[PDB]
Design an enzyme around this catalytic site. Structure first.
Site, PDB file in Angstrom:
ATOM      1  N   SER A 168      15.097   4.548  -7.869  1.00 55.90           N
ATOM      2  CA  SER A 168      15.964   3.605  -7.183  1.00 55.90           C
ATOM      3  C   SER A 168      17.401   3.710  -7.681  1.00 55.90           C
TER       4      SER A 168
ATOM      5  N   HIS B  21      11.296   9.186  -5.450  1.00 54.37           N
ATOM      6  CA  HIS B  21      10.767   9.081  -6.795  1.00 54.37           C
ATOM      7  C   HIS B  21      11.374  10.129  -7.718  1.00 54.37           C
TER       8      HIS B  21
ATOM      9  N   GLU C 112      14.656  -6.145  24.075  1.00 54.25           N
ATOM     10  CA  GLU C 112      14.508  -7.072  22.969  1.00 54.25           C
ATOM     11  C   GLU C 112      15.764  -7.057  22.107  1.00 54.25           C
TER      12      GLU C 112
ATOM     13  N   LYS D  43       9.255 -10.701  -8.939  1.00 50.85           N
ATOM     14  CA  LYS D  43      10.472 -10.949  -8.178  1.00 50.85           C
ATOM     15  C   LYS D  43      10.224 -10.773  -6.674  1.00 50.85           C
ATOM     16  N   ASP D  44       9.362  -9.820  -6.293  1.00 50.97           N
ATOM     17  CA  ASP D  44       8.986  -9.616  -4.897  1.00 50.97           C
ATOM     18  C   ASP D  44       8.232 -10.824  -4.332  1.00 50.97           C
TER      19      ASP D  44
HETATM   20  C1  HEM Z   1       8.724   0.886   7.370  1.00 51.71           C
HETATM   21  C2  HEM Z   1       9.990   0.867   6.966  1.00 51.71           C
HETATM   22  C3  HEM Z   1      10.349   1.018   5.536  1.00 51.71           C
HETATM   23  C4  HEM Z   1       9.689   0.663   4.382  1.00 51.71           C
HETATM   24  C5  HEM Z   1       8.316   0.006   4.205  1.00 51.71           C
HETATM   25  C6  HEM Z   1      10.559   1.019   3.311  1.00 51.71           C
HETATM   26  C7  HEM Z   1      10.234   0.779   1.973  1.00 51.71           C
HETATM   27  C8  HEM Z   1      11.084   1.039   0.911  1.00 51.71           C
HETATM   28  C9  HEM Z   1      10.832   0.686  -0.441  1.00 51.71           C
HETATM   29  C10 HEM Z   1       9.620  -0.106  -0.952  1.00 51.71           C
HETATM   30  C11 HEM Z   1      11.895   1.162  -1.171  1.00 51.71           C
HETATM   31  C12 HEM Z   1      12.083   1.016  -2.675  1.00 51.71           C
HETATM   32  C13 HEM Z   1      12.513  -0.448  -2.954  1.00 51.71           C
HETATM   33  C14 HEM Z   1      13.774  -0.874  -2.211  1.00 51.71           C
HETATM   34  O1  HEM Z   1      14.888  -0.342  -2.436  1.00 51.71           O
HETATM   35  O2  HEM Z   1      13.819  -1.772  -1.336  1.00 51.71           O
HETATM   36  C15 HEM Z   1      12.775   1.835  -0.283  1.00 51.71           C
HETATM   37  C16 HEM Z   1      13.944   2.459  -0.672  1.00 51.71           C
HETATM   38  C17 HEM Z   1      14.736   3.124   0.248  1.00 51.71           C
HETATM   39  N1  HEM Z   1      14.600   3.182   1.580  1.00 51.71           N
HETATM   40 FE1  HEM Z   1      13.230   2.351   2.604  1.00 51.71          FE
HETATM   41  N2  HEM Z   1      11.679   1.559   3.780  1.00 51.71           N
HETATM   42  C18 HEM Z   1      11.624   1.602   5.105  1.00 51.71           C
HETATM   43  C19 HEM Z   1      12.565   2.044   6.009  1.00 51.71           C
HETATM   44  C20 HEM Z   1      13.720   2.682   5.632  1.00 51.71           C
HETATM   45  C21 HEM Z   1      14.741   3.067   6.497  1.00 51.71           C
HETATM   46  C22 HEM Z   1      14.768   2.843   8.001  1.00 51.71           C
HETATM   47  C23 HEM Z   1      15.687   3.701   5.704  1.00 51.71           C
HETATM   48  C24 HEM Z   1      16.963   4.350   6.091  1.00 51.71           C
HETATM   49  C25 HEM Z   1      17.604   4.478   7.265  1.00 51.71           C
HETATM   50  C26 HEM Z   1      15.247   3.681   4.362  1.00 51.71           C
HETATM   51  C27 HEM Z   1      15.937   4.269   3.328  1.00 51.71           C
HETATM   52  C28 HEM Z   1      15.606   3.949   2.022  1.00 51.71           C
HETATM   53  C29 HEM Z   1      16.448   4.413   0.921  1.00 51.71           C
HETATM   54  C30 HEM Z   1      17.691   5.289   1.023  1.00 51.71           C
HETATM   55  C31 HEM Z   1      15.901   3.895  -0.195  1.00 51.71           C
HETATM   56  C32 HEM Z   1      16.405   4.053  -1.623  1.00 51.71           C
HETATM   57  C33 HEM Z   1      17.309   2.836  -1.851  1.00 51.71           C
HETATM   58  C34 HEM Z   1      17.737   2.715  -3.300  1.00 51.71           C
HETATM   59  O3  HEM Z   1      16.972   2.358  -4.205  1.00 51.71           O
HETATM   60  O4  HEM Z   1      18.896   2.914  -3.627  1.00 51.71           O
HETATM   61  N3  HEM Z   1      14.048   3.054   4.366  1.00 51.71           N
HETATM   62  N4  HEM Z   1      12.255   1.741   0.982  1.00 51.71           N
HETATM   63  C1  HEM Z   2       5.108  -1.176  13.256  1.00 49.88           C
HETATM   64  C2  HEM Z   2       4.042  -1.853  13.704  1.00 49.88           C
HETATM   65  C3  HEM Z   2       4.066  -2.551  15.013  1.00 49.88           C
HETATM   66  C4  HEM Z   2       5.088  -3.117  15.742  1.00 49.88           C
HETATM   67  C5  HEM Z   2       6.571  -3.184  15.411  1.00 49.88           C
HETATM   68  C6  HEM Z   2       4.501  -3.655  16.924  1.00 49.88           C
HETATM   69  C7  HEM Z   2       5.228  -4.289  17.942  1.00 49.88           C
HETATM   70  C8  HEM Z   2       4.667  -4.894  19.056  1.00 49.88           C
HETATM   71  C9  HEM Z   2       5.361  -5.652  20.026  1.00 49.88           C
HETATM   72  C10 HEM Z   2       6.847  -5.976  20.031  1.00 49.88           C
HETATM   73  C11 HEM Z   2       4.447  -6.066  20.947  1.00 49.88           C
HETATM   74  C12 HEM Z   2       4.747  -6.980  22.124  1.00 49.88           C
HETATM   75  C13 HEM Z   2       4.319  -8.389  21.615  1.00 49.88           C
HETATM   76  C14 HEM Z   2       4.352  -9.510  22.636  1.00 49.88           C
HETATM   77  O1  HEM Z   2       5.439  -9.960  23.041  1.00 49.88           O
HETATM   78  O2  HEM Z   2       3.299 -10.010  23.097  1.00 49.88           O
HETATM   79  C15 HEM Z   2       3.180  -5.569  20.570  1.00 49.88           C
HETATM   80  C16 HEM Z   2       2.020  -5.784  21.294  1.00 49.88           C
HETATM   81  C17 HEM Z   2       0.820  -5.235  20.880  1.00 49.88           C
HETATM   82  N1  HEM Z   2       0.573  -4.505  19.775  1.00 49.88           N
HETATM   83 FE1  HEM Z   2       1.841  -4.002  18.435  1.00 49.88          FE
HETATM   84  N2  HEM Z   2       3.188  -3.436  16.904  1.00 49.88           N
HETATM   85  C18 HEM Z   2       2.857  -2.760  15.810  1.00 49.88           C
HETATM   86  C19 HEM Z   2       1.597  -2.348  15.402  1.00 49.88           C
HETATM   87  C20 HEM Z   2       0.447  -2.417  16.175  1.00 49.88           C
HETATM   88  C21 HEM Z   2      -0.786  -1.843  15.820  1.00 49.88           C
HETATM   89  C22 HEM Z   2      -1.120  -1.034  14.573  1.00 49.88           C
HETATM   90  C23 HEM Z   2      -1.664  -2.134  16.814  1.00 49.88           C
HETATM   91  C24 HEM Z   2      -3.057  -1.655  16.767  1.00 49.88           C
HETATM   92  C25 HEM Z   2      -3.509  -1.528  17.992  1.00 49.88           C
HETATM   93  C26 HEM Z   2      -0.955  -2.895  17.802  1.00 49.88           C
HETATM   94  C27 HEM Z   2      -1.490  -3.437  18.927  1.00 49.88           C
HETATM   95  C28 HEM Z   2      -0.742  -4.207  19.812  1.00 49.88           C
HETATM   96  C29 HEM Z   2      -1.374  -4.768  21.010  1.00 49.88           C
HETATM   97  C30 HEM Z   2      -2.837  -4.642  21.416  1.00 49.88           C
HETATM   98  C31 HEM Z   2      -0.400  -5.427  21.672  1.00 49.88           C
HETATM   99  C32 HEM Z   2      -0.506  -6.147  23.008  1.00 49.88           C
HETATM  100  C33 HEM Z   2      -1.007  -7.584  22.957  1.00 49.88           C
HETATM  101  C34 HEM Z   2       0.195  -8.453  22.704  1.00 49.88           C
HETATM  102  O3  HEM Z   2       1.245  -8.464  23.382  1.00 49.88           O
HETATM  103  O4  HEM Z   2       0.167  -9.192  21.729  1.00 49.88           O
HETATM  104  N3  HEM Z   2       0.329  -3.048  17.360  1.00 49.88           N
HETATM  105  N4  HEM Z   2       3.351  -4.842  19.412  1.00 49.88           N
HETATM  106  C1  LIG Z   3       3.739   2.510  -3.140  1.00 49.47           C
HETATM  107  C2  LIG Z   3       2.318   2.532  -2.619  1.00 49.47           C
HETATM  108  C3  LIG Z   3       1.339   2.664  -3.784  1.00 49.47           C
HETATM  109  C4  LIG Z   3       0.501   3.936  -3.740  1.00 49.47           C
HETATM  110  C5  LIG Z   3       1.199   5.115  -4.418  1.00 49.47           C
HETATM  111  C6  LIG Z   3       1.546   6.163  -3.385  1.00 49.47           C
HETATM  112  C7  LIG Z   3       0.395   7.159  -3.295  1.00 49.47           C
HETATM  113  C8  LIG Z   3       0.916   8.584  -3.252  1.00 49.47           C
HETATM  114  C9  LIG Z   3       1.767   8.894  -4.472  1.00 49.47           C
HETATM  115  C10 LIG Z   3       1.444  10.287  -4.965  1.00 49.47           C
HETATM  116  C11 LIG Z   3       2.519  11.300  -4.639  1.00 49.47           C
HETATM  117  C12 LIG Z   3       2.749  12.115  -5.894  1.00 49.47           C
HETATM  118  O1  LIG Z   3       3.577  11.283  -6.703  1.00 49.47           O
HETATM  119  C13 LIG Z   3       3.813  11.810  -7.995  1.00 49.47           C
HETATM  120  O2  LIG Z   3       2.764  11.437  -8.882  1.00 49.47           O
HETATM  121  C14 LIG Z   3       2.964  11.796 -10.258  1.00 49.47           C
HETATM  122  C15 LIG Z   3       1.757  11.267 -11.016  1.00 49.47           C
HETATM  123  O3  LIG Z   3       1.093  10.266 -10.226  1.00 49.47           O
HETATM  124  C16 LIG Z   3       4.298  11.237 -10.792  1.00 49.47           C
HETATM  125  O4  LIG Z   3       4.561  11.738 -12.103  1.00 49.47           O
HETATM  126  C17 LIG Z   3       5.210  10.809 -12.988  1.00 49.47           C
HETATM  127  O5  LIG Z   3       4.265  10.040 -13.726  1.00 49.47           O
HETATM  128  C18 LIG Z   3       3.425  10.700 -14.693  1.00 49.47           C
HETATM  129  C19 LIG Z   3       2.771   9.592 -15.523  1.00 49.47           C
HETATM  130  O6  LIG Z   3       2.723   8.356 -14.781  1.00 49.47           O
HETATM  131  C20 LIG Z   3       4.149  11.745 -15.571  1.00 49.47           C
HETATM  132  O7  LIG Z   3       3.215  12.762 -15.947  1.00 49.47           O
HETATM  133  C21 LIG Z   3       5.325  12.462 -14.891  1.00 49.47           C
HETATM  134  O8  LIG Z   3       6.176  13.005 -15.903  1.00 49.47           O
HETATM  135  C22 LIG Z   3       6.131  11.570 -13.940  1.00 49.47           C
HETATM  136  O9  LIG Z   3       7.028  12.336 -13.130  1.00 49.47           O
HETATM  137  C23 LIG Z   3       5.445  11.642  -9.860  1.00 49.47           C
HETATM  138  O10 LIG Z   3       6.686  11.058 -10.273  1.00 49.47           O
HETATM  139  C24 LIG Z   3       5.132  11.200  -8.442  1.00 49.47           C
HETATM  140  O11 LIG Z   3       6.134  11.675  -7.549  1.00 49.47           O
END
Ligand code: HEM
Ligand code: HEM
Ligand SMILES: CCCCCCCCCCCCO[C@@H]1O[C@H](CO)[C@@H](O[C@H]2O[C@H](CO)[C@@H](O)[C@H](O)[C@H]2O)[C@H](O)[C@H]1O
Ligand SMILES: CCCCCCCCCCCCCCCCCC(=O)OC[C@H](COP(=O)([O-])OCC(O)COP(=O)([O-])OC[C@@H](COC(=O)CCCCCCCCCCCCCCCCC)OC(=O)CCCCCCCCCCCCCCCCC)OC(=O)CCCCCCCCCCCCCCCCC
Ligand SMILES: CCCCCCCCCCCCCCCCCC(=O)OC[C@H](COP(=O)([O-])OCC[N+](C)(C)C)OC(=O)CCCCCCCCCCCCCCCCC
Ligand SMILES: CCCCCCCCCCCCCCCCCC(=O)OC[C@H](COP(=O)([O-])OCC[N+](C)(C)C)OC(=O)CCCCCCCCCCCCCCCCC
Ligand SMILES: CCCCCCCCCCCCCCCCCCCC(=O)O[C@H](COC(=O)CCCCCCCCCCCCCC)COP(=O)(O)OCCN
Ligand SMILES: CCCCCCCCCCCCCCCCCCCC(=O)O[C@H](COC(=O)CCCCCCCCCCCCCC)COP(=O)(O)OCCN
Ligand code: HEC
Ligand code: HEC
Ligand code: HEM
Ligand code: HEM
Ligand SMILES: CCCCCCCCCCCCO[C@@H]1O[C@H](CO)[C@@H](O[C@H]2O[C@H](CO)[C@@H](O)[C@H](O)[C@H]2O)[C@H](O)[C@H]1O
Lengths: 244, 383, 85, 54, 244, 383
Positions: free
Chosen positions: B206, B202, B272, B228-229
């Site tokens: 982006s 932030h 996997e 768009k999302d």
């Molecule tokens: C749970 C996994 C992740 C979530 C939910 C997540 C979510 C996001 C979101 C919502 C953004 C801003 C919108 C977008 O560009 O798509 C973002 C940006 C970014 N993420 Fe992730 N991300 C994840 C994993 C990762 C991983 C594995 C990497 C790197 C190895 C990464 C690196 C970045 C970077 C560098 C940006 C800035 C991209 C840009 O705007 O130029 N994130 N991520």
């Molecule tokens: C990043 C989030 C997660 C990933 C990538 C993930 C991934 C997986 C995978 C690959 C399996 C094996 C599925 C199958 O072939 O049956 C599995 C099983 C399971 N996961 Fe997760 N998991 C996640 C989050 C969670 C969370 C938050 C819970 C809360 C308990 C959970 C509970 C389970 C349980 C109980 C199973 C075994 C039953 C089954 O195989 O379906 N997982 N998970």
């Molecule tokens: C994406 C999931 C949605 C939930 C949001 C994530 C929750 C946790 C975020 C809080 C972390 C602190 O995040 C910080 O917050 C302040 C105010 O909120 C932001 O501050 C920004 O917005 C405010 C007004 O909107 C301005 O006063 C400021 O000039 C600007 O920088 C920072 O840019 C951000 O980095």
């Protein structure tokens, strides 16, 4: 690896359930239960299926209760704490032929017949593998194959030597619906039944999927319209630059 | 002042999802971040629900999963959703990382979100590995056995560490129960790191597909990127639907429908699909410890992209040679994936080694050279 | 209602001189014995009634109720218990 | 005092090293001292005290 | 509630283990095991205790192995899948007198003797309750008490009528260490043994607690010095105000 | 600029734990916040560890807890730490809430942290209730039965809701397994709300025992309150040590060492001590639904303190009459606690009703009247 080590890959047969919109043929499921009961059940368990699971799939409530009530299951001990048996109920699981693995292996020259409840999901090929295996015992093994003792040649089985002999022969079952019980017919029915046993949600799942597909597709189309509508002021933006 | 700005809690949400100033030209590859958030939400909802019906004890685990499939209302759906979404999570994460590498999202001033991102990726791998063991089928057990035995390569203490991780002398009940507890935990840790990388982002905002500043021309996150999302959310849900309802086992291994048996070894023990490239890299090195180091280095080397990219320009949109190199790098990564699941046989052994060398040489040789040369071509070419 | 260092939101301050000495230069336990005895006594004496009055009232109430309950469930309390139910 | 300060305290690297080494020593000696004290106050009661009969 | 409905409250006896720094008397534990084995074990199980648990507490490795090896436990089935027995091992749990609840109740006029593994934690009073109960059967119930059939009067038991008769009488056990086996002695020993059975970590726990108490107290003292040291510039602050 | 201020992630930590400007005169009652954070950390560490050894299936749950006590290395400690810290968590939370009420921490501009705080308290109750059931002893089962049957009082749908919560027709295996999953989850939710109430607080900063602004005279959180917090940390650990090592079962019920038995009803079914006042309030109302409403209202009524306190002055330090009333309110709350565990017998039935009336009349009558009168006394008294 050689093709033999892998096993021959089964043909893709046109199952009634193949097809995004297709259920199982329930008449085939019922016939396949009868093949299970009269042929496979001598050696194979179906431990994950309860009598209640047949109801409204292959059998009525009464037919399934009749199957359960013919058997004896372990009851809770009596008042002196002595063991007792009771007749089966719909809640009971279908009982296996053997008390344990050791008894199973002793009856099958060392080989262990697997439980068949998940076998359609536990093998590459599913129904096609089951059908191909049951119908794929050649009269004679290909020249040069040496079978280990108690092994039978079947090209679909990895390695080629399977501990299960051919069991389906024309007319080993007499179907209750008059269908001619050929090797092929019985193999098709039992493969269908076992596919159902592995995935009993199949029919419902695919119907819910149809509903989801329709709703999600419509929402995708509408989301495109709405995105384009909201974005048009940005897309349509025009500039005039007059350098200061 | 508007309440959304005045109230400190509302203002935090506001700053991320509503007033957040975005470049006006993000393309569809910027949608993977919200898809990853969606996967995380699905995994939390389905995972917590599975945990209400699952038993972690080794005598009951496999059967509790069958109980979910057969007896629990919509248990089949929740199970298949959880299993398939794990795969979708990796598709989205590879796409997101691919976007980041192509568009130079790792460059200053975004080194910190990228570096936290690398940790997120490691946490996802660990999460998914442990969740896969919970089924306690044949692939669960044997996959756990071989992967945990890699720790035995740590010098001096390696064996002791493995027995410590297992809670015994092989993978068994203690292992399964601890993997359940940690599988539950790790997604919460992952959510925290996901939030951290966004907070780190932030400060710069982006990046965008042109690689230039967007400070000149910003758009509110809402309504533009919200709507768009939604398009990609519904495209994702269509893909989800096709797998979960029509082909729920396409991405899985049939051997995981066989209960774990420490005696019988499965024909082939493969991870996997999403772990396959790293497995191919491990196989390429003949030494045990060497192989483990290479496998870990294959992920940690992402941390040096900010250094080895010598370009004066952010991202590949205007760099024909970098684009070609990127294309070869990506296809090589897919080939590594394929080689992770072939048998250890000729000629795949040598091919795996060549592809491993190419993987590392992208970071260490090719990207530094190509980016240096392109700098010179831009300068001389535009004189 | 709170800013940060340099703009905390204080009204303008002027005319106050503040003095103190280094922790290394001071005896941290200077006057500890006097404080532990006399200061604590003053502090406790001034607050005693606000604790004593409610504690003693509610303890008395409890004592009476628990004694009655005990007596009601003896032989002697049979008749009074029958009326109470 | 100057010497002691200069060697063990002035540099934080040295101070932390001294603290950790002292913690190691403390941990080992405290363990031994408690073990002996525990055995004396519970003399005649523990398995180690009656083991010889069996 | 009436005192009778509650049960008489047991005296506080001075157990060797009472006292922050006190272990169990292990000689008493060993004697109490012998009372368990020769008296209580006829009706009561100790299912949570394995033979290995006695080792280095009450018995040597060899004595406990000898106890285990005298018994037969269910083995894995043989090669024909028939049941087998094996001699006991240290890993085995002490076997109970009855196969199930129904057999237990049939032998005890309907009453179920509880498992004694947790009984010292599962009753208010602990060791004192066990001692008081075993030694608190009066020769004659107080005049006016009507006992239900198969009930015995014991004032410590809530309601007064217990299904367990008095079992400890002078000399029902002959202790192997020569201690006179009076009712009181046996009750004390078995109550100690059962307290150990409920909390086997007891001795180690209290020793670790001593270490924690010492370290934490010292750290508390030092944290007070450090707080006061750091705060003294704030506490010692003085002001001179000259109104502008 | 110092890195701790420059880097956005470090600056967030900095703003809460280091440069955070605090009043210079916080007394020891301001130390309960950090003790609550300590309890939360202990519960997370011990709870996740117990989850590695616990089996949620009703046939194995009680035995898995015995396995923890007997076989797991230091299992006794981890179990006793978890069980006793649940009690300490409530001692600290009552002290913290008591501080807040005495010092007027609920007044503007701190209504939002107080209101989020009320939700934290509800989440703690639900967390602890579900955790207690996991043992599956007699108190576990019967406590779950009685408490979940209160939901039956919801008109029209109550019975259906209870069966839905149980996953069956009584408390059994489905109930235990879902309580395990939700007990694991709820502490994470609680951590989030704890963070939210601190972020909400950060707009006004901490109040102080004088009730005046501290904007005139601020002290850095570190080192001053860091080292002051250590004193109470070690005092807490001393109390913890005395319970966990020397009297680990003092706060528990012996009946929870008997395995759950749906046939046999325990002599008395009482909640854990920290829920007893609310149980007494419920008993006071003869109507089932009335009782449930009163019990919930007893917590939700905390939300109206900002309205019913009519004082022009924050907190009780300078208000003799309000201090007396506060004393009676607190002692009444303790008496309610005691009455929650007596038998439903004379004369405790009527006493419980009187104490319940007093509890509610504090909020609805006495505090509004006393605070109005004290306003007038301050004004007239100082003329
Ligand atoms: C749970 C996994 C992740 C979530 C939910 C997540 C979510 C996001 C979101 C919502 C953004 C801003 C919108 C977008 O560009 O798509 C973002 C940006 C970014 N993420 Fe992730 N991300 C994840 C994993 C990762 C991983 C594995 C990497 C790197 C190895 C990464 C690196 C970045 C970077 C560098 C940006 C800035 C991209 C840009 O705007 O130029 N994130 N991520
Ligand atoms: C990043 C989030 C997660 C990933 C990538 C993930 C991934 C997986 C995978 C690959 C399996 C094996 C599925 C199958 O072939 O049956 C599995 C099983 C399971 N996961 Fe997760 N998991 C996640 C989050 C969670 C969370 C938050 C819970 C809360 C308990 C959970 C509970 C389970 C349980 C109980 C199973 C075994 C039953 C089954 O195989 O379906 N997982 N998970
Ligand atoms: C994406 C999931 C949605 C939930 C949001 C994530 C929750 C946790 C975020 C809080 C972390 C602190 O995040 C910080 O917050 C302040 C105010 O909120 C932001 O501050 C920004 O917005 C405010 C007004 O909107 C301005 O006063 C400021 O000039 C600007 O920088 C920072 O840019 C951000 O980095
Ligand atoms: C649980 C986990 C364990 C951790 C321990 C944390 C407890 C710390 C805490 O908040 O209480 C200490 C706390 C000491 O805190 P402090 O910061 O020195 O003073 C706060 C007030 O200023 C104190 O008010 P005061 O300055 O007016 O002093 C009055 C008080 C305290 O007297 C003192 O001198 C101290 O005296 C009393 O005890 C009241 C009279 C009762 C007599 C009977 O003790 C009390 O205040 C007790 C009074 C409560 C009623
Ligand atoms: C397979 C090989 C892919 C090579 C891509 C080369 C560029 C191209 O043609 O893409 C079209 C577009 C070209 O976009 P662009 O932004 O360069 O150009 C837009 C148009 N002009 C030049 C006029 C401004 O590239 C992308 O959108 C690339 C995103 C990369 C995502 C890769 C995912 C792979 C996952 C593996 C992880 C490890
Ligand atoms: C029991 C009854 C307690 C009544 C307290 C009355 C005030 C008093 O004497 O306290 C000393 C002190 C007095 O402190 P003070 O801040 O009012 O006065 C300091 C000294 N002067 C006046 C010179 C500035 O009060 C506290 O520190 C009160 C904190 C309240 C915590 C209560 C916890 C109960 C939990 C129940 C939750 C529901
Ligand atoms: C978690 C995974 C998220 C993905 C959801 C996809 C479908 C899951 C629902 C089950 C289903 O198949 O629904 C069908 C209809 O499809 C539908 O209409 C559902 C498709 C809609 C997808 C997106 C809509 C919301 C998804 C998540 C929002 C969460 C908010 C509240 C839960 C069948 O219909 P039926 O007959 O089974 O229906 C009962 C009432 N007639
Ligand atoms: C989780 C609950 C936290 C509370 C901890 C209190 C005591 C638990 C320690 C275990 C214990 O019994 O240790 C005893 C000593 O206690 C002690 O000396 C420990 C008291 C120290 C108080 C807190 C100091 C830091 C602890 C928390 C930090 C953990 C993570 C940071 C890296 C004796 O055990 P032993 O001496 O036989 O042990 C073998 C090494 N000789
Ligand atoms: C009297 C014995 C016997 C009968 C009858 C029998 N089987 Fe089997 N079956 C076996 C044995 C033994 C194996 C194990 C073979 C091996 O692993 O070498 C086996 C294995 C299988 C396998 C798994 C092969 C594999 O890939 O591991 C399937 C599927 C199968 N049987 C299905 C059936 C069906 C369907 C029927 C009858 C309609 C049937 N069986 C009848 C003994 C029998
Ligand atoms: C031949 C029968 C028998 C013998 C011998 C016996 N008990 Fe029992 N015991 C019972 C029965 C039956 C109950 C259940 C009584 C009831 O609930 O009414 C019982 C109950 C108990 C209880 C629990 C009472 C309660 O509060 O629920 C304890 C403790 C106990 N026995 C300990 C012992 C000890 C210690 C010994 C011997 C050293 C012993 N018993 C010998 C039959 C026996
Ligand atoms: C606010 C935090 C928490 C509180 C107040 C809390 C409270 C409790 C309580 C009162 C019990 C019953 C203890 C007993 O008498 O044996 C319990 C048991 C349990 N808790 Fe928690 N808990 C918390 C956090 C957690 C977490 C994060 C986990 C992670 C899984 C967890 C796992 C368990 C388990 C497995 C048990 C059952 C085993 C046992 O009884 O010790 N708890 N909890
Ligand atoms: C997990 C439980 C909780 C934790 C960890 C926690 C933590 C804290 C911390 C660290 C502070 C700042 C320091 C202090 O004043 O003690 C604080 C302040 C506060 N908390 Fe809590 N808290 C919790 C529960 C609650 C509850 C249940 C309430 C209210 C019903 C509450 C209301 C407040 C208020 C109003 C303040 C500001 C007090 C002031 O400085 O004047 N909190 N809390
Ligand atoms: C408690 C554990 C420690 C981890 C920190 C807790 C995580 C919560 C932090 C996210 C919430 C956003 O937190 C918000 O951050 C910014 C800067 O960081 C603070 O901003 C404050 O400090 C900075 C400098 O230190 C100043 O520029 C600003 O004038 C001042 O208001 C906000 O007062 C705080 O509300």
């Amino acid at each position: 690896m050689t093709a033999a080590e892998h096993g021959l890959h089964p043909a893709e047969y046109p199952w009634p359930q193949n097809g995004m919109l297709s259920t199982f043929d329930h008449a085939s499921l019922r016939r396949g239960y009868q093949v299970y009961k009269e042929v496979c059940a001598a050696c194979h368990s179906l431990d994950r299926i309860a009598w209640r699971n047949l109801v409204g799939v292959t059998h009525t409530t009464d037919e399934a209760k009749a199957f359960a009530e013919e058997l004896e299951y372990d009851d809770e001990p009596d008042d002196e704490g002595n063991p007792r048996k009771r007749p089966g109920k719909l809640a009971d699981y279908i009982p296996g032929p053997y008390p344990n693995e050791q008894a199973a292996r002793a009856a099958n020259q060392g080989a262990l017949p697997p439980d068949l409840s998940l076998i359609a999901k536990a093998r590459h090929g599913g129904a096609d593998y089951i059908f191909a295996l049951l119908t794929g015992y050649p009269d004679e093994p290909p020249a040069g194959v040496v079978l280990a003792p108690g092994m039978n040649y079947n090209p679909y089985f990895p390695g080629g030597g399977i501990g299960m002999a051919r069991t389906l022969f024309d007319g080993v079952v007499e179907y209750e619906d008059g269908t001619p019980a050929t090797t092929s017919q019985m193999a098709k029915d039992v493969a269908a039944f076992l596919t159902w046993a592995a995935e009993p949600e199949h029919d419902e799942r695919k119907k819910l999927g149809l509903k989801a597909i329709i709703v999600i597709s419509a929402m995708l189309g509408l989301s495109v319209y709405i995105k384009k509508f909201k974005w048009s002021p940005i897309k349509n933006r025009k500039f005039i630059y007059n350098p200061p | 002042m508007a309440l959304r700005k005045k109230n400190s809690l509302l203002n935090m949400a506001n700053s991320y999802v509503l007033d957040s100033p975005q470049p006006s030209n993000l393309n569809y590859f910027w949608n993977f971040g919200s898809l990853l958030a969606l996967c995380l939400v699905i995994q939390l909802a389905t995972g917590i629900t599975l945990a209400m019906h699952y038993t972690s004890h080794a005598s009951l685990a496999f059967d509790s999963v069958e109980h979910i499939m057969r007896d629990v209302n919509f248990g089949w759906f929740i199970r298949y959703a959880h299993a398939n979404t794990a795969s979708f999570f990796f598709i989205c994460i590879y796409a997101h990382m691919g976007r980041n590498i192509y568009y130079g999202s790792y460059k200053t001033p975004r080194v910190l979100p990228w570096s936290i991102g690398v940790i997120i990726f490691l946490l996802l791998i660990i999460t998914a590995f442990m969740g896969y063991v919970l089924v306690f089928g044949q692939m669960s057990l044997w996959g756990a056995t071989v992967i945990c035995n890699l720790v035995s390569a740590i010098p001096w203490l390696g064996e002791d560490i493995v027995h410590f991780l297992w809670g015994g002398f092989s993978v068994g009940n203690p292992t399964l129960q601890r993997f359940f507890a940690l599988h539950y935990l790790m997604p919460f840790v992952l959510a925290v790191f996901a939030l951290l990388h966004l907070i780190a982002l932030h400060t710069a905002g982006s990046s965008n597909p042109l690689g230039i500043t967007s400070n000149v021309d910003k758009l509110s996150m809402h309504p533009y990127y919200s709507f768009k999302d939604l398009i990609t959310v519904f495209a994702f849900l269509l893909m989800f639907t096709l797998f979960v309802f029509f082909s729920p086992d396409k991405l899985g291994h049939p051997d995981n429908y066989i209960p774990a048996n420490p005696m019988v070894t499965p024909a082939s023990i493969v991870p996997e699909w999403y772990l396959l490239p790293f497995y191919a890299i491990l196989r390429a090195i003949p030494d045990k410890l060497g192989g483990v180091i290479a496998m870990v280095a294959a992920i940690l080397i992402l941390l040096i992209l900010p250094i080895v990219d010598r370009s004066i320009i952010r991202g590949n949109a205007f760099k024909p040679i970098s684009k070609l190199l990127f294309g070869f790098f990506i296809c090589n990564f897919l080939l590594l994936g394929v080689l992770g699941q072939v048998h250890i046989e000729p000629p795949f052994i040598v091919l795996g080694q060549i592809c491993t060398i190419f993987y590392f040489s992208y970071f260490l040789i090719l990207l530094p050279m190509v980016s240096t040369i392109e700098n010179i071509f831009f300068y001389i070419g535009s004189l | 209602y709170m800013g940060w260092w340099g703009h905390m939101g204080s009204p303008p301050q002027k005319g106050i001189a503040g003095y103190t000495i280094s922790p290394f230069a001071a005896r941290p336990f200077a006057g500890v014995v006097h404080a532990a005895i006399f200061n604590t006594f003053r502090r406790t004496k001034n607050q005693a009634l606000f604790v004593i009055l409610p504690v003693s009232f509610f303890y008395y109430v409890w004592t009476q109720a628990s004694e009655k309950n005990e007596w009601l469930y003896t032989k002697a309390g049979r008749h009074e218990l029958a009326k109470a139910l | 005092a100057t010497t002691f300060y200069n060697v063990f305290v002035k540099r934080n690297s040295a101070f932390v090293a001294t603290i950790l080494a002292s913690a190691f020593v403390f941990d080992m000696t405290f363990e031994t001292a408690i073990d002996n004290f525990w055995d004396r106050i519970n003399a005649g009661k523990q398995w180690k005290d009656i083991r010889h009969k069996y």
